[PDB]
Design an enzyme around this catalytic site. Structure first.
Site, PDB file in Angstrom:
ATOM      1  N   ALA A   1      49.576   5.414  34.167  1.00 58.47           N
ATOM      2  CA  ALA A   1      49.392   5.430  35.620  1.00 58.47           C
ATOM      3  C   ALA A   1      47.896   5.609  35.887  1.00 58.47           C
ATOM      4  O   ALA A   1      47.242   6.456  35.274  1.00 58.47           O
ATOM      5  CB  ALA A   1      50.201   6.567  36.270  1.00 58.47           C
TER       6      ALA A   1
ATOM      7  N   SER B   1      52.215  12.469  26.967  1.00 58.49           N
ATOM      8  CA  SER B   1      51.028  11.847  27.543  1.00 58.49           C
ATOM      9  C   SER B   1      49.924  12.871  27.821  1.00 58.49           C
ATOM     10  O   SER B   1      49.187  12.764  28.805  1.00 58.49           O
ATOM     11  CB  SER B   1      51.406  11.111  28.831  1.00 58.49           C
ATOM     12  OG  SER B   1      50.549  10.005  29.024  1.00 58.49           O
TER      13      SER B   1
ATOM     14  N   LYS C   1      55.515   3.649  25.856  1.00 61.58           N
ATOM     15  CA  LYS C   1      54.389   4.501  26.243  1.00 61.58           C
ATOM     16  C   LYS C   1      53.991   4.069  27.650  1.00 61.58           C
ATOM     17  O   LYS C   1      53.638   2.914  27.885  1.00 61.58           O
ATOM     18  CB  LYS C   1      53.184   4.365  25.315  1.00 61.58           C
ATOM     19  CG  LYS C   1      52.033   5.290  25.728  1.00 61.58           C
ATOM     20  CD  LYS C   1      52.419   6.777  25.599  1.00 61.58           C
ATOM     21  CE  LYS C   1      51.516   7.710  26.429  1.00 61.58           C
ATOM     22  NZ  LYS C   1      51.895   7.789  27.890  1.00 61.58           N
TER      23      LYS C   1
ATOM     24  N   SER D   1      47.212   5.435  30.285  1.00 57.54           N
ATOM     25  CA  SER D   1      47.735   6.066  29.073  1.00 57.54           C
ATOM     26  C   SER D   1      48.429   5.216  28.022  1.00 57.54           C
ATOM     27  O   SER D   1      48.757   5.716  26.950  1.00 57.54           O
ATOM     28  CB  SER D   1      48.645   7.232  29.440  1.00 57.54           C
ATOM     29  OG  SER D   1      47.859   8.281  29.976  1.00 57.54           O
TER      30      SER D   1
ATOM     31  N   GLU E   1      39.758  10.589  28.456  1.00 56.40           N
ATOM     32  CA  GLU E   1      40.658  10.962  29.536  1.00 56.40           C
ATOM     33  C   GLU E   1      40.003  12.117  30.284  1.00 56.40           C
ATOM     34  O   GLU E   1      39.400  12.990  29.667  1.00 56.40           O
ATOM     35  CB  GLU E   1      42.014  11.412  28.972  1.00 56.40           C
ATOM     36  CG  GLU E   1      42.831  10.293  28.343  1.00 56.40           C
ATOM     37  CD  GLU E   1      43.601   9.464  29.363  1.00 56.40           C
ATOM     38  OE1 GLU E   1      43.237   9.458  30.563  1.00 56.40           O
ATOM     39  OE2 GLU E   1      44.579   8.805  28.952  1.00 56.40           O
TER      40      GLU E   1
ATOM     41  N   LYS F   1      47.069   5.379  24.606  1.00 57.54           N
ATOM     42  CA  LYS F   1      47.402   6.469  23.693  1.00 57.54           C
ATOM     43  C   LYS F   1      48.224   5.968  22.505  1.00 57.54           C
ATOM     44  O   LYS F   1      48.061   6.454  21.387  1.00 57.54           O
ATOM     45  CB  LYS F   1      48.142   7.581  24.447  1.00 57.54           C
ATOM     46  CG  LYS F   1      47.210   8.346  25.378  1.00 57.54           C
ATOM     47  CD  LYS F   1      47.907   9.381  26.265  1.00 57.54           C
ATOM     48  CE  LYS F   1      46.886   9.995  27.236  1.00 57.54           C
ATOM     49  NZ  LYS F   1      47.477  10.511  28.492  1.00 57.54           N
TER      50      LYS F   1
END
Length: 255
Positions: free
Chosen positions: A204, A97, A201, A39, A133, A42
């Site tokens: 995982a 997230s 930010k 993430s 994602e 992002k």
């Protein structure tokens, strides 16, 4: 050294790059080894979005349905019947997230390939976005798809938040959302002294991948750009946030 000792205590590999923008002093450890970015991407995605859209454009309402929703949609799953503006999607992707928010934003800028082209334009020749994602988290050893390095992720974050890839107003926009992130209280935030401001930010992924990238401001002094990445050898390995907080203390201590 200190970082190797952490890899031993947590049985994980550490990817670290820190730059004091006021002295050019750095702290590195496996700064160029690849890790699934998860993430953290992002943040760079919104950075590119701010490059293409005017503030007015962000008010555009994006509609979607129950099926567009993926695996982790904390905010977007509560607005299916009304849609969300681009500004709201950016807030949810960065601060919560939200995976669907990222996908809708990603789609807005042209998909993973467009994101790659734009990062290549700003000088980032390492980050390799390929999927949406949550598939982008599916990264196996040896693979470069959806991976980057601590140096590349920190540099690209620096480019959008501190350099000139975005005009001040948009810069402040990106920084304020990240300053108010809700997912990294146990990571970089837990490794800096009181009084230090953090805009981060988190991420995982598989193989126990646990990352955090940020811009941190000492009470007194210029900003520090930092990327702390990690992974483990078991595909289903669990990660420990304490590793990031500790690595950050080492970085603060060294700088």
């Amino acid at each position: 050294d200190d970082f190797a000792k952490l890899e031993e205590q947590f049985d994980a590999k550490l990817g670290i790059f820190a730059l004091d923008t006021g002295t050019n002093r750095t702290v590195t450890y496996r700064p160029d080894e690849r890790f699934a970015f998860a993430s953290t991407i992002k943040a760079l995605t919104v950075g590119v979005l701010l490059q293409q859209k005017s503030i007015e454009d962000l008010n555009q309402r994006i509609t979607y349905t129950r099926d567009d929703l993926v695996n982790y949609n904390p905010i977007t799953e509560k607005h299916v019947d009304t849609g969300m503006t681009l500004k709201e999607l950016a807030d949810a992707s960065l601060r919560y997230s939200d995976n669907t928010a990222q996908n809708l934003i990603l789609k807005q800028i042209g998909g993973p390939e467009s994101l790659k082209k734009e990062l290549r334009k700003i000088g980032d020749e390492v980050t390799n976005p390929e999927r949406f994602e949550p598939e982008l988290n599916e990264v196996n050893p040896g693979e470069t798809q959806d991976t980057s390095t601590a140096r590349a992720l920190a540099t690209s974050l620096q480019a959008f938040a501190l350099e000139d890839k975005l005009p001040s107003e948009k810069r402040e926009l990106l920084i304020d959302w990240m300053k108010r992130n809700t997912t990294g209280d146990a990571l970089i935030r837990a490794g800096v002294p009181e009084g230090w401001e953090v805009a981060d930010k988190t991420g995982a992924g598989s193989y126990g991948t646990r990352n955090d990238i940020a811009i941190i401001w000492p009470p007194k002094g210029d900003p520090v750009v930092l990327a702390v990445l990690s992974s483990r050898d078991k595909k289903d390995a669990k990660y420990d946030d304490k590793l990031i907080a500790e690595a950050t203390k080492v970085v603060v201590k060294a700088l």
